[PDB]
RNA sequence: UGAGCCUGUUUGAUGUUCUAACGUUGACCCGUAAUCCGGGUUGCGGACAGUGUCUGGUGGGUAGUUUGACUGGGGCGGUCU
RNA sequence: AAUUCCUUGUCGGGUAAGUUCCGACCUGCACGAAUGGCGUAAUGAUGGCCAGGCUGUCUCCACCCGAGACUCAGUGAAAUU
RNA sequence: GCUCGCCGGAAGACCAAGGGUUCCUGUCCAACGUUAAUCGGGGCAGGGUGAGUCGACCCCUAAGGCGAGGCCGAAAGGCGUAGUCGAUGGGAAACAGGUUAAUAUUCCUGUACUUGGUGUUACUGCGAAGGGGGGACGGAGAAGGCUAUGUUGGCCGGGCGACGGUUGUCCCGGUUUAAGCGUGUAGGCUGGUUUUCCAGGCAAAUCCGGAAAAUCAAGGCUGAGGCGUGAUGACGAGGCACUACGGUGCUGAAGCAACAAAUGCCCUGCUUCCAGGAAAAGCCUCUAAGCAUCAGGUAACAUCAAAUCGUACCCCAAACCGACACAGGUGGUCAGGUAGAGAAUACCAAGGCGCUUGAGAGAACUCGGGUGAAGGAACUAGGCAAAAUGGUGCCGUAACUUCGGGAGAAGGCACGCUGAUAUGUAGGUGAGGUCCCUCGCGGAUGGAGCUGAAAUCAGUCGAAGAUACCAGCUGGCUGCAACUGUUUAUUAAAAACACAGCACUGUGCAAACACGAAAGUGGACGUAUACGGUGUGACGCCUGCCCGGUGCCGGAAGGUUAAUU
RNA sequence: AGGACCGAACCGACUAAUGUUGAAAAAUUAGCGGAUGACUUGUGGCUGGGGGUGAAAGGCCAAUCAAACCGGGAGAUAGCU
């Protein structure tokens, strides 16, 4: 549910927050945790390589399951949990042999729900099947790109992929960006679409909110001197030139894809 | 008013010490130069 | 299918198929007490991608430099045989 | 007008008297719509103007309390020429 | 030696870093000390630092470093696997009194505790480079129980006052005791035990995880404080004699109760919020290979061992960083009385200091201050500087507004001391006694004793009762930027930068992009509700016409053009 | 509850006077902003000069920055004093 903040302060006048009174209030499952330390955008040479990164809150990593290769054993959902490393909640699942795991939460997954994986499973949200055994004209998420590798497509909140046609040993998919792609039919996908679809309705409201997430300020190129940026200099406010990146390439229209090895799998491009 | 020199023995020895000089190739040239000149004190080791 | 040449001759181009060079930041086994590395088995691409020599285009991202004299001070104007 | 050269433009209010301030006129030397246009409660060691109280800022200065300056014994520089 | 003045959340006491003999004793006054010097952190000689429990060394790791083979590179070299280093973090154990010119949890007295080796007895399934538990973790808030600590009574010792009074409801001093051992309280968390079965934990399991039955409902863990013992001991005002003025030997009275109360402890607890809050070892358990007469394991006795290095002195400072015996800088701990909300301010306690040139005089002028007749901004570029308001409780308060604000708007009234309501009230704490019990640090009642605001009524003094220190000036109209924030260390703090919100464009994951002659690394252990670049800058109403020029995106029939042949 | 309010320790630097061979090669006195957060502080580690970092002032990189310091080419060149 979305809630506005009362204007008790100028830093709260414009805050909109999302609250879900169903997530766990407690500690995460311990045997599925690891350490994770911050970088600052620097590489092994010590140099800044990506800008506007630094600070934030301390976080821990949860081992999420992206393969779903345990076939024939039903699993039952236990609880939904909050994850700081992504924009989608997670779910804890208990198996019939006494093993627990973490999975992504589709929309409408609540405690007491069954889930299963393999070639002999039912067609309903949360189940995992090879893509050769799903009707054409279906919505899925967490689609593999090579057999046995894992999921890489439609992993954000409120996203999905659509199956359009099937031929040979390939299937044609429509993606969120607006592109049509070919993939092998022996790949896997999960039925439904990802949850937390209101994730995008929130307003941070102040600068400290963005500071808490590890984002540092951005400095405009027209506010510098001509030795720091190709946009700098001028008595007053002067531009008189075409926009470019800090290293001299033209923004606002130019194209920057060059990969001839993967051009046979794009049927049509985004518009 | 604060000033420039603030001492610390660990930092001094980790920066300009004998084993630090021996570590690389140019420090050994520093040592060779100072030996050729004939210095009484070779490093900051104390 | 264009030139030679009597349905045979070699090279030219275009399109489809194949595996054996080459790629794999897909799965399993060993060195091994190891998410580097190498060897093996199996899939997926495949003469494409990529690298060396030569060659046309773009290139203030970077570098080296030039931007004249007379003159009731210099500049603007005018002049230089 | 943070923009108007001619300019202290012209009319009104405020003062005994107002090149600054507030409201209008349009004759915009040379405003104008994301190098945004027009408004706007709250906030500002931000620019401009007017009032009450308060006073040595001032008409116009007088007295007093401490530290130097001045005399005595000890130590004892400097720029420049 | 007597008197005077200053600090006292420090100008007192103590750790770490940094320094290195500056520490104690005897001697000297040439140079050093901004003056003299018998004095000194100055010269010369000797003396002084005692550890199984304090630190370091040691065991374990974070960021990071190095790195056998290996992958790259004209050489020099770069990156990294297995490993090995690296604290600001985790891991055993001691208290009180006495003593020196200089050391004290180290030396002496009294009473304790922890970990290893060897031998003898009694019982006995042991064993890791492996499986599991534990260590193990955020911000704010609230009130319940305690202690360190202070005040007053009771008790003990002394006193009867330099000038009116002082045998009393009077004056001064003391009334201290630890670690260890035993008891499980205020309070927090959690159902116990037996049986059968199983696609899980890289192989096994009596361990952890899952499933199904019978049975009893009260077991298990953590836990400040208090009470007993340690303690017939030690300490304690005063007394008994010689003084080298530094002590020795003996002796030693009282040593209880009530109230008030922490920022310290129970509390790593409890309640809520999103921005979701380290790793390894020490420790407890399960088994494999292997051993079974043995070896190893559990407990009680006896005995041996705990090595090496630091330990003096300075720390808002004359001994550290500033060339100085320099009005500057420097992390952590301790927290008495009266008034006060207070760690602010004023006066004091414990303790420590008067700042290393003096004596006179009382001109102009400069520096820091107090008062001022009548006027009250007339000064000046400008109310720059100075003058002024200032507390608590109760009345009362406008335009405008994003409905929270404006607001402490503005403007008012009361405020000392004594007596009564009540020989000390409303409230807090709480003994003796009477009952009960599953018997103890138990429950109900009962009110002795102690402590104690605010209000009303009547009197009284001064010119003045928030009397000292302390402690907002108020209002009206306009430009700019929405707001809290940031910036030219050393002449510019702003209308300049950033910001939440908006739009355009690139990127299908071996992603675009950036650091690298390369291997590689960040973006990210992320996947279009995600990531990079560019411009505008809360919110409300909006954002018109032009594709000729320069850029970017798409097209394919024509014309022009490189190497090669 | 709050990038909420008043105000000490703590972090800063808006106004005036003194000082300018200073007590000080950036300070003293009286006033002034923030003060539960985009806060402040101790110990270690990383980024190297046409390079780094930069809420962006040509700011900082050991009292030195429109290209640090040290040693070399080196007795660079100087139609000028």
What is the residue extent of each domain of chain A?
1-113, 117-194, 195-271
DSSP tag of A171: E
Distance CA A183, CA A131 (A): 10
| Long-range contacts at A161-169 (CB < 8 A, ≥ 24 apart) | A161/A189, A162/A138, A163/A131, A163/A134, A163/A135, A163/A136, A163/A137, A163/A138, A163/A139, A164/A136, A164/A137, A165/A136, A166/A136
By C-alpha distance, which of A179, A101, A163 is closest to A130?
A: A163
Method: cryo-EM
Which residues put CB within 7 Å of chain D, the nucleic strand? Answer: A 10, 222, 237-239
Q: Please tell me the distance from the alpha carbon of residue A233 to that of residue A152, in angstroms, as a whole number.
A: 45
**Protein-contacted positions of strand D (CB under 7 Å):** 35-36, 42
CATH fold of A1-113 reads OB fold (Dihydrolipoamide Acetyltransferase, E2P) (2.40.50)
Among A220, A224, A221, which Cα is nearest to A233's?
A: A224
Q: What are residue B8's DSSP bridge partners?
A: none
Are A109 and A126 in contact, with CB atoms under 8 Å apart? Answer: yes
The secondary element (H helix, E strand) that includes residue A210 is helix A207-211
Distance in angstroms (rounded) separating the CA atoms of residues A239 and A222: 7
Q: How many CB atoms lie under 10 A from the CB of residue A100?
A: 13
Identify which of B46, B41, B42 has the alpha carbon closest to the alpha carbon of residue B13.
B46
| Span CA (A240) to C1' (E544), Å | 24
Q: Which residue in B34, B3, B36, B4 sits closest to B16, CA to CA?
A: B34
Contact A153, A238 (CB under 8 A): no
CATH topology of domain B1-46: Helix Hairpins (1.10.287)
The CATH code of domain A195-271 reads 4.10.950.10
Residues present in chain B in total: 46
Nucleotide with the nearest C1' to A196 CA: E529
| Spatial separation of the C-alpha atoms in residues A206 and A17, rounded to whole Å | 13
The neighbour count for residue B31, using CB atoms within 10 Å, is: 16
Distance CA A114, CA A112 (A): 7
Residues A247 and A229: their CA atoms lie apart, in Å, by: 8
Within this chain, domains A1-113 and A195-271 share the same CATH topology: no
Domain ranges of chain B: 1-46
Q: Which long-range contacts (CB under 8 A, 24 or more apart) does B11-18 make?
A: B12/B44, B13/B44, B13/B45, B16/B43, B16/B44, B17/B43, B17/B44, B17/B45, B18/B42, B18/B43, B18/B45
Residues with CB under 7 A from strand F: A 8-12, 42, 45-48, 206-208, 211-212, 216-217, 219, 223-228; B 1, 4-5, 8, 10-11, 14
Spatial CA neighbour of A191 closest among A124, A146, A94, A102: A124
Q: Does nucleic acid strand E have an atom less than 7 angstroms from the CB of A241?
A: no
Backbone angle region of B17, left / alpha / beta, with phi > 0 → left and psi within -120 to 50 → alpha: beta
Helix (H) / strand (E) containing A76: strand A75-81
Residue A170 exposed, middle or buried by CB count within 10 Å (0-12, 13-18, 19+):
middle
Q: Where are the beta strands (DSSP E) in A86-194?
A: 90-95, 100-104, 114-115, 128-130, 139-141, 143-144, 151-153, 161-167, 170-174, 180-184, 188-191
| Cα gap A153→A142, rounded to integer Å | 5
């Amino acid at each position: 549910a979305v809630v506005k903040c009362k204007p008790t302060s100028p830093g709260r006048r414009h805050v909109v927050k999302v609250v879900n009174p169903e997530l766990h209030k407690g500690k995460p499952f311990a045997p599925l945790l690891e350490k994770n330390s911050k970088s600052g955008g620097r590489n092994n040479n010590g140099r800044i390589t990506t800008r506007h990164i630094g600070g934030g809150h301390k976080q821990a990593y949860r081992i999420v399951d992206f393969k779903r290769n345990k076939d024939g054993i039903p699993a039952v959902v236990e609880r939904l949990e909050y994850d700081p490393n992504r924009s989608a909640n997670i779910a804890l699942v208990l198996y019939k042999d006494g093993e627990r795991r973490y999975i992504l939460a589709p929309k409408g997954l609540k405690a007491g729900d069954q889930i299963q994986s393999g070639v002999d499973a039912a067609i309903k949200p949360g189940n995992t099947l090879p893509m050769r055994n799903i009707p054409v004209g279906s919505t899925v998420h967490n689609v593999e790109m090579k057999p046995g590798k894992g999921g890489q497509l439609a992993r954000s909140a409120g996203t999905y992929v659509q199956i359009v046609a099937r031929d040979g040993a390939y299937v044609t998919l429509r993606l969120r960006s607006g592109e049509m792609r070919k993939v092998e039919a022996d790949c896997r996908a999960t039925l439904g679409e990802v949850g937390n679809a209101e994730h995008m309705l929130r307003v941070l409201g102040k600068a400290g909110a963005a500071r808490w997430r590890g984002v540092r300020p951005t400095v405009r190129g027209t506010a510098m001197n001509p030795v720091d940026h190709p946009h700098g200099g001028g008595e007053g406010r002067n531009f008189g030139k075409h926009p470019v990146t800090p290293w001299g390439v033209q923004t606002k229209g130019k194209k920057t894809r060059s990969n001839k090895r993967t051009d046979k799998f794009i049927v049509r491009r985004r518009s | 008013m604060k000033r420039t020199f603030q001492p610390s023995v660990l930092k001094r020895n980790r920066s300009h010490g004998f084993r630090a000089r021996m570590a690389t190739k140019n420090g050994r040239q520093v040592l060779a130069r100072r030996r050729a000149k004939g210095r009484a004190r070779l490093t900051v080791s104390k």
